[model samples]
Target: GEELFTGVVPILVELDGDVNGHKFSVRGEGEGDATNGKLTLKFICTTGKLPVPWPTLVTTLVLCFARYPDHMKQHDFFKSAMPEGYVQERTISFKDDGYYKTRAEVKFEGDTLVNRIELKGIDFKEDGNILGHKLEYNLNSHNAYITADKQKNGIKSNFKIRHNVEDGSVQLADHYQQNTPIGDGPVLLPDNHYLSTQNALSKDPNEKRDHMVLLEFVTAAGIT
Candidate 1:
């Protein structure tokens, strides 16, 4: 009735550069090989001078949404809500359908470290409407490798459901409007939902196995 795995994530670190960030490199290491599982990450933060404020860092990242660069979206499905760089100091992490089989977003804003940022998961349907699932999550770091601070007040994105299959190879699906589509949010999701024929339509009965939702984000460098 449930899928579970080992975990100890959000291991924080205070470090000090770029590419990998001012803090130590971060990664979510998983145990079981389930298609959907949580990966634990170790962090190291910088102890020296920090460059920016956390709020500004968060705001800047919001403006970094570019078009989809994924292989599937090779040529389509990534339109920007606002012009690029409208906001800076942000990196969006998209981990599509993990062991939890859900899509999540991590927003980063600077904290004393100039690169520290906030991570948040906006719960919504295939359409972007900011629904109830008020899962507030945040992180602090330089470039990447964020540390998951305790989720603030409000509920986290804990919505769960079952996936149905219809017919076709890439089509195996029932089309749950609950799953939020990619892009600035829904309305624009249609222009972005890319997958093998099965997923787009009804999944082929032969392999209509439980599939994972997509969790990802776009990144913009620091502003101030």
Candidate 2:
């Protein structure tokens, strides 16, 4: 059995400039345990100068911290408690009961890299989410893109997050959430459960998956 831990853990980060890359870093460390059950996780993105959007970078960092022993090809089930209808669309086949398989082709044309994903499996549906999702990253232009038809909970859209290495600037112009549904408002996360998904898919079928559960509690009197 596992013991319940109650404590407030703070995350601190210092941002000097935008994602175009000035100087940014983040650090945090904490976990708990009893006897047979245990939990331990930590993260640190050292000082670096790279062009990346602030929020986008923060989100990516959050994803990096969330990723544990990848049991499947994707980690979409991590943010289920927040918004159910939009954003944070993860691959359904990667879930516990879902079985997803695919065929991919990767090639490059001139300065652009092209990657394609096509679904092919007996256990998966033809109209399943992320079945035909495509991703392309242009090396010459420093541009990244993802395109899919109803890949996100029946929502259809073309997504693009632009980045500039010359001067260090990132624009989420094509991000649907930033433009509609939810504007630049106070978005909140209700829990510390990050990157929640199935235990690794292997022949053994029994692997210890990992995740960080943030616990918090504030009291007036302290002296245990």
Candidate 3:
């Protein structure tokens, strides 16, 4: 009998940027498990870019391997981590946008497992117009798809996950608004481990770039 991994693994991220007059530096620490493939990261700003009473700006970033789950658990976690008033205010902002579902799936591609995720409903306001942001991810194949409702505001993003099966050297890099994908792809990957990173930069020159770092691991046991 083989035992499966049920616990989570650690993930770390570092981000720094100044885009359109908003500047901030933050680091994130989180956990994820292979079972549900959910990652929840909390970022606390070191420097404030916007004018606000709070010295630190706390934000949450979540990535799910499958369709996005209901917000009750997310909300419950937020309530414990954030100020009551701030939580209430944030919930109100969410109502302005109609509900949109994010989708994710995993399937067998030959002998390899391929995973994909698509995000919808996330948007921003530009020049009094509401613009939508779309994101898609293809893991194992090492592909990223990104777009915006407006071509003028479309985003440029790239990332690469390279593994040297010969020497076991692995490297990952993500760039936002970058033209080319980073590393060599179509490399063979080991079972039970995954690595990927995402970066995005807007079409507008005034907009800054953002980066993401992700690495996942799992443990298992066997009995005979």
Residue 26, candidate 3: C-alpha displacement in angstroms? 2.3
Q: What's model 3's TM-score?
A: 0.28
Q: For residues 1-224, could you state the per-residue lDDT of candidate 2 as single tens digits?
A: 00011222122222222221223343334432212112232323345422222222222221212222323212222112112112232211222112312222222223222222332223322332212211111211122122222332221222343432333433222322111111222222211122221111111134132211222211111111
Clashes within 3 Å, all models in order: 51, 6, 4
| Candidates sorted on lDDT, descending | 3, 2, 1
lDDT of each: 0.21, 0.24, 0.27
Quote the positional error of residue 82 for candidate 3 in Å.
34
Give the clashing pairs for model 2. Answer: 19-52, 20-51, 20-168, 21-50, 71-200, 78-196
Q: Give the lDDT of residue 1 in candidate 1.
A: 5
Model 2 spans > 4 angstroms off: 1-47, 62-170, 173-224
User: For model 2, what is the C-alpha lDDT against the true structure?
Assistant: 0.24
lDDT against true structure, model 3: 0.27
**C-alpha positional error of residue 122 in candidate 2 after TM-score superposition, expressed in Å:** 34
> What are the RMSDs of all candidates, in order?
19.9, 20.5, 20.3
Judging by lDDT against the true structure, name the best candidate. Answer: 3
Give the TM-score comparing model 1 with the true structure, all chains together. Answer: 0.17
Q: Cα deviation of 28 in candidate 1 (Å)?
A: 17
